[PDB]
Amino acid sequence: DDKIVPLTEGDIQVLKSYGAAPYAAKLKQTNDLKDIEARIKEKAGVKESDTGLAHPLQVARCTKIIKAKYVINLKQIAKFVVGLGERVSPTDIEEGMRVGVDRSKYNIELPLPPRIDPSVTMMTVEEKPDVTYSDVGGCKDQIEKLREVVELPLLSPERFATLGIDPPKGILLYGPPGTGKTLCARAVANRTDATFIRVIGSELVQKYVGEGARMVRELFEMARTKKACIIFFDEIDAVGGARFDDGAGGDNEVQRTMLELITQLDGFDPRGNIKVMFATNRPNTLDPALLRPGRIDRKVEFSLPDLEGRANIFRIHSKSMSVERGIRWELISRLCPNSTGAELRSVCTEAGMFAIRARRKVATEKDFLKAVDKVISGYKK
Amino acid sequence: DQVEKDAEDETFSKEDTLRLCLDIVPYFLKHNGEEDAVDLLLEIESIDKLPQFVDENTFQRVCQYMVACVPLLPPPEDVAFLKTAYSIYLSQNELTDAIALAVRLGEEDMIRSVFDATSDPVMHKQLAYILAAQKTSFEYEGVQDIIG
Amino acid sequence: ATAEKLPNIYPSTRCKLKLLKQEEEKKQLEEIRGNPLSIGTLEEIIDDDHAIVTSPTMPDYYVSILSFVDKELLEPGCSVLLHHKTMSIVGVLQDDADPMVSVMKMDKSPTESYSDIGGLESQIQEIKESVELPLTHPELYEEMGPPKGVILYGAPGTGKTLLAKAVANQTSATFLRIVGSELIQKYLGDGPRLCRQIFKVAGENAPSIVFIDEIDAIGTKRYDSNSGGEREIQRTMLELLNQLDGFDDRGDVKVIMATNKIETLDPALIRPGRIDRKILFENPDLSTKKKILGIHTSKMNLSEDVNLETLVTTKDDLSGADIQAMCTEAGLLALRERRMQVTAEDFKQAKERV
Numbered sequence: 001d002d003k004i005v006p007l008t009e010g011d012i013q014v015l016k017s018y019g020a021a022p023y024a025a026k027l028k029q030t031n032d033l034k035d036i037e038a039r040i041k042e043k044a045g046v047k048e049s050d051t052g053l054a055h056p057l058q059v060a061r062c063t064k065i066i067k068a069k070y071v072i073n074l075k076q077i078a079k080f081v082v083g084l085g086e087r088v089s090p091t092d093i094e095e096g097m098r099v100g101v102d103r104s105k106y107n108i109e110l111p112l113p114p115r116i117d118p119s120v121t122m123m124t125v126e127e128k129p130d131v132t133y134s135d136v137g138g139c140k141d142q143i144e145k146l147r148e149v150v151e152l153p154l155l156s157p158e159r160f161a162t163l164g165i166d167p168p169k170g171i172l173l174y175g176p177p178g179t180g181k182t183l184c185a186r187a188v189a190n191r192t193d194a195t196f197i198r199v200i201g202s203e204l205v206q207k208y209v210g211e212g213a214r215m216v217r218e219l220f221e222m223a224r225t226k227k228a229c230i231i232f233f234d235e236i237d238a239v240g241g242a243r244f245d246d247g248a249g250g251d252n253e254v255q256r257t258m259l260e261l262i263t264q265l266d267g268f269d270p271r272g273n274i275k276v277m278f279a280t281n282r283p284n285t286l287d288p289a290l291l292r293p294g295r296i297d298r299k300v301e302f303s304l305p306d307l308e309g310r311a312n313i314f315r316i317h318s319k320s321m322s323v324e325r326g327i328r329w330e331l332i333s334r335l336c337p338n339s340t341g342a343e344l345r346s347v348c349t350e351a352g353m354f355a356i357r358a359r360r361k362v363a364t365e366k367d368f369l370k371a372v373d374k375v376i377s378g379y380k381k
Numbered sequence: 382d383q384v385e386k387d388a389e390d391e392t393f394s395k396e397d398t399l400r401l402c403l404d405i406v407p408y409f410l411k412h413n414g415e416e417d418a419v420d421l422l423l424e425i426e427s428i429d430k431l432p433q434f435v436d437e438n439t440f441q442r443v444c445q446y447m448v449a450c451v452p453l454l455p456p457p458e459d460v461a462f463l464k465t466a467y468s469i470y471l472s473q474n475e476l477t478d479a480i481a482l483a484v485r486l487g488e489e490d491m492i493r494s495v496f497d498a499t500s501d502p503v504m505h506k507q508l509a510y511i512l513a514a515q516k517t518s519f520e521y522e523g524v525q526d527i528i529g
Numbered sequence: 530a531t532a533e534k535l536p537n538i539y540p541s542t543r544c545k546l547k548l549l550k551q552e553e554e555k556k557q558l559e560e561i562r563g564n565p566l567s568i569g570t571l572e573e574i575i576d577d578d579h580a581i582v583t584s585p586t587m588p589d590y591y592v593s594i595l596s597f598v599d600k601e602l603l604e605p606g607c608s609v610l611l612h613h614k615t616m617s618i619v620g621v622l623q624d625d626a627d628p629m630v631s632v633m634k635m636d637k638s639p640t641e642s643y644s645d646i647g648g649l650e651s652q653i654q655e656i657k658e659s660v661e662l663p664l665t666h667p668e669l670y671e672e673m674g675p676p677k678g679v680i681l682y683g684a685p686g687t688g689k690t691l692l693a694k695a696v697a698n699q700t701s702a703t704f705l706r707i708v709g710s711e712l713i714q715k716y717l718g719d720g721p722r723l724c725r726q727i728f729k730v731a732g733e734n735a736p737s738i739v740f741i742d743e744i745d746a747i748g749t750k751r752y753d754s755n756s757g758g759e760r761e762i763q764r765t766m767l768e769l770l771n772q773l774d775g776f777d778d779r780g781d782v783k784v785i786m787a788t789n790k791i792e793t794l795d796p797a798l799i800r801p802g803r804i805d806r807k808i809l810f811e812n813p814d815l816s817t818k819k820k821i822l823g824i825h826t827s828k829m830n831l832s833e834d835v836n837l838e839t840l841v842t843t844k845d846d847l848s849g850a851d852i853q854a855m856c857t858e859a860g861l862l863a864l865r866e867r868r869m870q871v872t873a874e875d876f877k878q879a880k881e882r883v
Contacts, residue, residue, distance in 0.1 A: 001416045001442075003449035003485055005531035012538035019545035026550035031558040035595040039561050042593040042617065045579060049590055049615040056573045056605075057581055059589045075587055097591035097615060098581055114591075120573060120605045176797040177767075178774050202721035202768035205760075211718075235767045238721075243755045254717060254760070281797065285754060321673030342774075343802035345674075350805050352672030353658045361671065375805055381796045420530060 045097060054095035057114045059102050062095030070094030074102040083107035117218055125197040125226065132190040135180025138313035138341045139187075142300050146171070146188050149298045153272050154192040154228055160272065168297035169271030174283040175302030178234050179342040181279050184302075185232050194275065195229030201238025204261075205254050212239070213260040220264050223274045230275035241285030262289045304338040313341050317348040321355065324362040332368045336376065346375040385424035388456040393426050406434060413439050416446065423454035432461035437469065440478055448482045452490075463494070473498040483511075489518045492528070561595060562610075562619050569611040570624075574600055582609065582616055594618040630730050631723035634706030634740070641694030647821025647849050649692055652808045655679060656696045659806045660738075663780030664700035677777035678739065678784025679806035680799070682791070685742070687821075687850035688810015689787040693740055702736035702783065709747035713761055720747060720765030728772040731782055740785040749793045770798055777803045812846035821849045826876075829856045834873035843877065855880035 054063040054071075062071035070093040073080045082093055083106055092099035092111040100114020101107075136143060145168075153160055153167035160166050173181050180187075182198060189196030199219060204212030223229055239258045245251035265276060278296065280286075290296055311333040318329070332347060350371040351363035358367055384394040406418035422430055431451060439447070444466060452458045463482075467475050476498035483491035492512060499508045512519045512528065519529060549555065570583035581591040583606065592611065594600060598620035603609065610619030643653050656679050662668065663675035681689040697704035705727060712723045731737050747765040751758050774797060776782065786804070813821055822837050840855070847855070855876055862875035 002446040008531055008535055016541055030550045031554035032561055034597045035561040038596050045593055046615040046617045061588050200771055205718035234771055238764055238767055240754055245755050322671055342800055345802035346805050349674045352674055356668050356672055375801055378807055379801055
């Protein structure tokens with residue numbers, strides 16, 4: 001009530017100050033020119049299209065110049081090709097501001113790429129991932145080869161050429177998916193700052209046909225655009241592996257989507273620069289055409305070493321937590337069998353609540369022992 | 382509107398009017414809640430009533446908003462309830478409500494109010510920090526080194 | 530009194546708000562734009578301060594923003610202000626709507642609070658600690674971290690469903706409830722998009738509570754990827770798993786798993802280290818049942834013939850719903866009795882039915 005209303009009284013007047021204030025310098029500055037300049041500037045640019053009534057572009061309408069119109073329509077209105085002989089225009093074929101081939105190529109260049117792509121890449125690529133050393137904890141043996149597969153050739157391509165070779169042009173990852181697995185790819189991706197394409201096969205098969213084919217191309221297209229790029233597939237099992245489900249007959253395109261992926265990746269794609277990487281649960285599912293060399297060369301598990309790896313991994317993980325320095329991760333690691341550089345967080349990460357249940361800063365041995373028990377029992381899977 | 386803005390101009394009142402509302406402000410005190418004829422009283426500039434009205438009864442929120450009315454609002458400044466109804470201040474006479482009063486009014490007059498009730502060094506150690514946490518009032522000596 | 534001063538305060542705020550000199554300047558900035566202008570959809574971007582667009586009529590013109598507002602405020606494939614001349618981008622245009630994703634219960638801090646649902650608490654700690662606890666985010670800070678999600682079991686509408694929103698209410702994040710059977714389609718690949726759309730939301734609206742109910746169907750690895758086995762089963766799930774095994778949180782976006790078919794699922798579908806949590810609703814023991822009983826029994830009006838133990842001991846170990854359910858038809862009997870205060874008999878009846 002009253003005294004609070006004094007605060008409420010202060011509330012009103014305070015707000016009125018700005019209200020009073022805001023009007024002040026308002027009088028001073030008197031915003032056409034931020035745009036009306038640029039507007040009228042780019043109104044030329046606008047008009048620079050608007051003559052002749054005119055990076056995916058899809059369609060250039062650069063329109064109706066007859067002497068001349070110098071454009072492609074890929075569209076159900078007036079499809080167009082400038083070529084048949086030597087047909088250009090000095091900077092730019094013509095207009096729309098759009099000048100160029102749409103996407104679908106007709107002659108070359110012509111006006112530098114107007115291009116390229118519709119649906120952006122419906123697939124999306126994070127370059128320099130948030131993982132460099134992130135899950136790299138305990139992951140060595142894999143990365144040890146990955147670095148060879150990926151890092152060093154990205155680093156010093158010359159050596160392999162100095163040798164006369166390339167890196168392994170394609171590589172497999174399996175075990176618990178993406179668990180550090182993709183991130184581990186993302187790791188050396190950001191370790192080397194190469195372009196890391198995370199494309200899931202889930203993206204590949206969709207409502208329509210040539211689906212990933214379209215993608216895989218655009219993939220393989222912008223592969224070479226993004227060159228020194230990591231094409232990465234988690235869920236090679238999404239499109240599936242080798243199968244006869246063409247005997248059923250509906251799968252064919254899905255099968256082909258692989259064969260797509262299969263076909264194009266084979267012949268022309270530089271895999272010393274453009275990296276190709278696969279993640280699955282089941283390497284047993286592969287279409288051998290995948291496992292082919294010069295397509296997949298290196299083959300690697302994710303993996304789950306020993307008591308020892310886990311400790312470090314534990315030791316790695318728990319540094320997040322406030323943790324009892326007396327108790328040994330070796331102690332804990334002894335108990336647990338081998339398990340995932342994800343699951344090993346259940347070791348640590350679960351104990352935080354133990355640490356909060358026990359209300360410790362630093363979880364005790366049993367806190368992890370229980371967690372070891374609790375989690376692993378809680379599996380029953 | 383009888384006695385009101387004698388409050389504003391300064392460098393008054395009809396007991397007819399004054400007493401008529403001494404059914405009313407109690408009609409609001411019989412309700413023990415809350416706010417109306419106080420404002421009628423804030424007008425009144427009678428140094429009887431504001432000592433005289435609620436020496437008793439109300440607490441919590443209740444006297445907390447009696448306070449800002451007591452010194453500030455009337456044509457003069459007033460205390461007595463904050464000595465007077467203040468007296469009984471059951472739940473710590475006066476600790477509970479007066480510290481809700483000791484805060485707000487970015488003042489210090491309520492420093493005794495806590496002193497009076499706050500008797501434990503350690504209840505006062507918190508009050509000490511509480512008086513300290515207003516440093517400007519508490520920082521200069523003569524409060525500091527005496528209160529400080 | 531101050532209410533008046535409060536109202537005009539609210540009023541004066543409206544004035545200054547509307548007061549958005551600058552007004553002219555703002556209008557100068559509008560007087561820039563001209564009008565009426567043309568909707569059109571984005572496609573890609575370059576620093577060009579010229580970009581081309583997308584239209585249903587499909588003119589696509591290479592056009593600048595009228596630049597005070599921003600390109601980076603927007604994404605390719607999004608409707609933008611365009612003139613009718615070149616379809617010049619006039620500036621940032623929503624293209625707000627997108628009010629759809631696949632099949633969900635779209636809700637936040639939902640009705641169900643653990644108080645409501647009858648006392649389950651023994652496992653509420655599970656869901657609380659794993660989620661609600663880092664939801665406070667205070668202690669989880671020191672904790673160094675929090676699992677992804679939980680796995681419900683037991684019966685829905687008592688254990689599974691009631692609990693589901695309990696912590697969802699409690700944490701007050703965006704609770705997203707779905708069924709896998711509310712996915713598919715039998716077709717391949719948007720099952721993932723279903724998830725994606727969901728995960729789009731999930732990514733977008735964080736914090737959120739992901740819920741999942743009854744994966745009987747999209748979740749079964751079977752033994753095989755061929756010989757009649759529907760890809761979409763795994764094909765979906767894997768992607769659901771990708772966004773599942775591609776994310777756990779410190780207390781932001783939380784997941785829920787509700788179903789009776791457990792090992793139908795991949796271990797990494799749980800992926801321990803991530804999903805540590807199995808909730809399983811049991812028949813509440815007489816006391817714990819009584820715990821739920823007293824709640825729903827009492828919130829049901831009744832005649833003092835009624836007693837909990839009168840109901841408690843007479844029971845086969847019902848579901849905590851059957852508590853509700855007995856209680857439910859119980860009054861229905863009293864309604865068939867056309868009375869507002871239920872006897873004890875209806876209860877025994879309503880239970881021995883249900």
